[PDB]
Amino acid sequence: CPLMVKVLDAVRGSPAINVAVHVFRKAADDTWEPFASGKTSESGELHGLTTEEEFVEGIYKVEIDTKSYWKALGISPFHEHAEVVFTANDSGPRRYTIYAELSPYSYSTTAVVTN
Amino acid sequence: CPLMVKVLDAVRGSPAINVAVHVFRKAADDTWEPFASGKTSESGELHGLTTEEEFVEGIYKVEIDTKSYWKALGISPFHEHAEVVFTANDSGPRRYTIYAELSPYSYSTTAVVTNP
Amino acid sequence: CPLMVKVLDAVRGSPAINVAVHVFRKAADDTWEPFASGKTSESGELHGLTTEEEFVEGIYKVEIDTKSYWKALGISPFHEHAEVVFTANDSGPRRYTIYAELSPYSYSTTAVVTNP
Amino acid sequence: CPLMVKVLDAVRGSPAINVAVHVFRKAADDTWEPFASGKTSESGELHGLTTEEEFVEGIYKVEIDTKSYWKALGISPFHEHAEVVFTANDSGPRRYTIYAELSPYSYSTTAVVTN
């Protein structure tokens, strides 16, 4: 599993559970092709999105549905979602972990890429 | 200015200067219509993007072109850009300041929304 | 002002108002001597802490009293405070702006350092 | 292990390895008593700092030696270190994970507290 997502709730100090995540791949016509998706687990994680075979070089977009998450908690949020757009490059480490720390009016994301 | 952007460079401890920013507004067909664009100043600030009159209700996307910024500094960063997508002015006119703090493999964005 | 602090509330999307800030400077015995204090304004800003003359070389600690801030909003936060410790003016006088973005279980701080 | 630390390098997009971490406990006389310490692993983690028996309620300080980390990489940093000060409370979740994302002139820290 070369692509992982770890989402944290900076308000409650807990993993962000049941957050919808959609991954897209940029197509030849510059549109976003659905690639993979899921809901974060009780540990705020989402793995098994793709395989080494399928995760070829290219531009990918990871959309985290933060708005629905905050609405479920009864908290008015700012963003429609958090977007993480990046290029997968074979000439570097294999495993991509996208960290995302969520607050109603702020989010931070950090990519950790390793072997 | 109802729409403002403040960008900081967390590697150099300075405002992020000459960063290109493109703003889009969602149309009916889910496509992103260009709304406004500019580049950050020496203070990492970008005002004069729009006016209260033109900045109507809608879903807006503020795209900060961080990749170019880092490459010019000799750094190969992770993200293509930093995207900030939000509904604006749905409860009346508001003033928005989008803060962004950039690192090659990380960014944070915080929105300050005030009622004039 | 050579020392400035800008604090934002990432839960409400606003400046963090009336946040107490204490600045200390390290002495010889590793103890923290009180240097200056204040509270953030409506803009989440705090200037007038010190002067160029008084702000000599040294190791400074900017302590932001976030716990009190969150408790007053009905939130029980994780941190006692947000501490920002740094060497200042060791290469001559500089201007420092300490940005802080607060959430109940998280905070970020970014320093902008400029040469006047 | 009720206390864990996960440190990430936001410049290189990798765990922050070999970062010294010192944990202190606030004593009756308001001074900081050394409690535990170590160096982050190849995964930027530091566990086995303490036990449930020893990790009683009280105020703790986690000092991350970020200055030495950046100096090793030949990068001039701003902070002397990153400090995370908090109260351990029995009336909540047991495991504390302190996340820290490091940049030369910025750091973010997020606490994740779970069962």
From Swiss-Prot, chains B, C:
Disease: Amyloidosis, hereditary systemic 1: A form of hereditary systemic amyloidosis, a disorder characterized by amyloid deposition in multiple tissues resulting in a wide clinical spectrum. AMYLD1 is an autosomal dominant form due to transthyretin amyloid deposition. Protein fibrils can form in different tissues leading to amyloid polyneuropathies, amyloidotic cardiomyopathy, carpal tunnel syndrome, systemic senile amyloidosis. The disease includes leptomeningeal amyloidosis that is characterized by primary involvement of the central nervous system.
Annotated phenotype, changing T40A: In AMYLD1; amyloid polyneuropathy
Effect seen on changing A82S: In AMYLD1; amyloid polyneuropathy
Coiled coil stretches, renumbered: none
Domain notes: Each monomer has two 4-stranded beta sheets and the shape of a prolate ellipsoid. Antiparallel beta-sheet interactions link monomers into dimers. A short loop from each monomer forms the main dimer-dimer interaction. These two pairs of loops separate the opposed, convex beta-sheets of the dimers to form an internal channel.
Gene: TTR
Keywords associated with the record: Amyloid, Amyloidosis, Cytoplasm, Disease variant, Gamma-carboxyglutamic acid, Glycoprotein, Hormone, Neuropathy, Phosphoprotein, Secreted, Signal, Sulfation, Thyroid hormone, Transport
Outcome following mutation: A100T: In DTTRH; increased affinity for thyroxine
Expression by tissue: Detected in serum and cerebrospinal fluid (at protein level). Highly expressed in choroid plexus epithelial cells. Detected in retina pigment epithelium and liver.
Gene source species: Homo sapiens
One record GO biological process: retinoid metabolic process
Quaternary structure (record): Homotetramer. Dimer of dimers. In the homotetramer, subunits assemble around a central channel that can accommodate two ligand molecules. Interacts with RBP4.
Outcome following mutation: K26N: In AMYLD1; amyloid polyneuropathy
Post-translational changes noted in the entry: Not glycosylated under normal conditions. Following unfolding, caused for example by variant AMYLD1 'Gly-38', the cryptic Asn-89 site is exposed and glycosylated by STT3B-containing OST complex, leading to its degradation by the ER-associated degradation (ERAD) pathway.
Known outcome of mutating T50K: In AMYLD1; amyloid cardiomyopathy
UniProt effect for mutating P15S: In AMYLD1; amyloid polyneuropathy
Protein name according to UniProt: Transthyretin
UniProt-reported outcome of changing A36T: In AMYLD1; amyloid cardiomyopathy
